Structure 1
Amino acid sequence: CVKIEEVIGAGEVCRGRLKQPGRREVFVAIKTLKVGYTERQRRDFLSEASIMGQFDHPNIIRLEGVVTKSRPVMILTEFMENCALDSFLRLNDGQFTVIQLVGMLRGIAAGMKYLSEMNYVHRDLAARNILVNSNLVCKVSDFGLEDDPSDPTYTSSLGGKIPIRWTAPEAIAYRKFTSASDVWSYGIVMWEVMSYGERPYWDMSNQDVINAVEQDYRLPPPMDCPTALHQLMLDCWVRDRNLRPKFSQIVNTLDKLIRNPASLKVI
């Protein structure tokens, strides 16, 4: 049933084909586990496959199937042509209209609205975890495939790795991970999108980021970013987590900007 085609990255992420008795052949992404898999590693990989299988939404990565009967174990998903959002934007620097970028952000927010409705807290919302297809539809993902190892994207923190640049201050400080801390991460995703995949906080060290945020520093609007979009980022980054908009309100605000495109001209 599963046929491999080419290796993408390093277990490993590969491209291939899948055929089931009743449905037509579709291109798939195959997440494999490294040779000589441990009982705990196999349990962690399958518990991740079980999470993805619970969801069904046009802005959430679709799980096509899972291989359990034969080694190596596999996670099969629908192949997303344009790969990760951050890498896709960096090579397409200034090649999209504001409306297209807003549509991408609306898709991400619709996916996040669905997750929050299912009572699921993502914890790692970032442009590197958003996949893009040929039609520019953005899909929220996780458990898939480094600018400076001195200021790593993830910090080895006791219980688990934390991406400091994308994490709400209360989730860094007290591990208070909620849909509101995912909204903070979404605000960082908005900034990554409007900047065509720049590194949040630039040269600032990871410790500088925590200190600056605590002292009310907020990322400036990227070049040519409409004021309304930046204001929405600032709303996502309220220190009071109760005042941050819900994903349903973000979707509503983005739709209001799409209906009134003149508001996307004000820079």
Structure 2
Amino acid sequence: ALLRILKETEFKKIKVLGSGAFGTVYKGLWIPEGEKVKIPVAIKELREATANKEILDEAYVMASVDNPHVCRLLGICLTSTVQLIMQLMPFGCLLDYVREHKDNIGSQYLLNWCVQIAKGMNYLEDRRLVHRDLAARNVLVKTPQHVKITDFGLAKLLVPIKWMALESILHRIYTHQSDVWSYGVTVWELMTFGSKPYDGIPASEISSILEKGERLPQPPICTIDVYMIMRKCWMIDADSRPKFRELIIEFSKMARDPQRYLVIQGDERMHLPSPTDSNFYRALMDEED
């Protein structure tokens, strides 16, 4: 009862928002039968085909998540392009957000985003769910103070080589510890204000340079404390990498003294919003717990 089966006639796609490997996302409108209102939604149109048991069985798990930092699948319409319905996130993806606001993001926002993504990932691990596609492009901004992990369970379809752990590239092993690798790359994206990992290196070569010990470089704003966490996420031995429960504690500790661990020009100028502005955001856009 956590996945609504929708009819073609009760929603409409109105504007294209973007695409990735698993199809196209639209801003759409849900029109409840009998009512006069139009409710904004996000619609993902898929494009892979090989069942009416495959997609639904995974969608049910997708609709079952319950964590403030994990996006929940809300509905589905089984047409020819299967359309998945979720909540609309007015701010877009975190990657573009950091790129567009890279001159307005202080250490407190960056570290709190790291904490929240780790909380969302720890939730997925607790539920025995492997993401397989964690990246800055798959973190949605609900409010600037509240981010949520998206695009989970689209393993019914198909690769993000430059975010994948070495054992995933070589052996197609996907575990929670391989998610820890992708988490490290996601943190690198945020701390570089949206740089492209291994920029200009063909994907067919990533496993080679990883085997020889090359890793993503230290972002200029990172102290050695933060970069060591990222490097530990990229250890070849998956069991030696940190766990999401541990990443929550460490990044939460750094978030209590953010200017000690990130060196950003003009940091003390940007703070978290006052309780006035957070209460205003939550009342209008973010009423969940």
- 1:198-213 alignment, distance < 5 Å: 198-213=195-210
Counterpart residue identity of residue 104, structure 2? Q
TM-score normalised per structure 1: 0.81
Secondary structure of the residue that 2:222 maps to in structure 1?
coil
| Among candidates 64, 68, 91, match of residue 54 of structure 1 | 64
Counterpart residue identity of residue 228, structure 1? D
Give deviations 1:58-100, integer Å, cap 9, x for gaps: 11112232234x6664311011112122222222223200110
Residue 213 of structure 2 corresponds to residue 216 of structure 1 = yes
Give deviations 1:244-267, integer Å, cap 9, x for gaps: 111000001011111233532569
Question: Matched residues, percent identical?
Answer: 35
Mapped partners of 1:93, 1:175: distance in 2:
35
Aligned to 1:87: 96
Mapped partners of 1:12, 1:233: distance in 2:
31
Q: In 1, are the aligned partners of 2:98 and 2:105 still within 8 Å (CA)?
A: no
Mapped partners of 1:208, 1:116: distance in 2:
30
Counterpart residue identity of residue 16, structure 1? G
State the shift of 1:33 in Å. 4.6
- CA separation of 1:3 and 1:245: change in aligned 2, threshold 3 A: same
Secondary structure of the residue that 2:74 maps to in structure 1?
strand
Aligned to 1:32: 45
- 1:3-42 alignment, distance < 5 Å: 3-9=12-18, 11-18=23-30, 26-33=39-46, 40=50
- 1:1-267 alignment, distance < 5 Å: 1-9=10-18, 11-18=23-30, 26-33=39-46, 40=50, 45-68=55-78, 73-142=82-151, 161-265=158-262
State the shift of 1:25 in Å. 7.1
Q: In 2, are the aligned partners of 1:15 and 1:28 still within 8 Å (CA)?
A: yes
Give deviations 1:80-127, integer Å, cap 9, x for gaps: 112122222222223200110111111111000000001111111111
Counterpart residue identity of residue 29, structure 1? A
Cα-Cα RMSD: 2.9
Counterpart residue identity of residue 101, structure 1? L
Mapped partners of 2:26, 2:213: distance in 1:
43
Mapped partners of 1:63, 1:220: distance in 2:
35
Give deviations 1:3-38, integer Å, cap 9, x for gaps: 5442324553211334669xx97531012356xx96
How many equivalent residue pairs? 248
Mapped partners of 2:27, 2:176: distance in 1:
32
- CA separation of 1:186 and 1:265: change in aligned 2, threshold 3 A: closer
Secondary structure of the residue that 1:257 maps to in structure 2?
helix
Give deviations 1:133-179, integer Å, cap 9, x for gaps: 234422111179xxxxxxxxxxxxxx985321111111111122110
Q: In 2, are the aligned partners of 1:228 and 1:263 still within 8 Å (CA)?
A: no
Unmatched 5+ stretches in structure 2: 1-9, 265-289
Q: Which runs of 4 or more aligned residues in structure 1 lie more than 4 Å from their structure 2 counterparts after TM superposition?
A: 41-45, 70-73
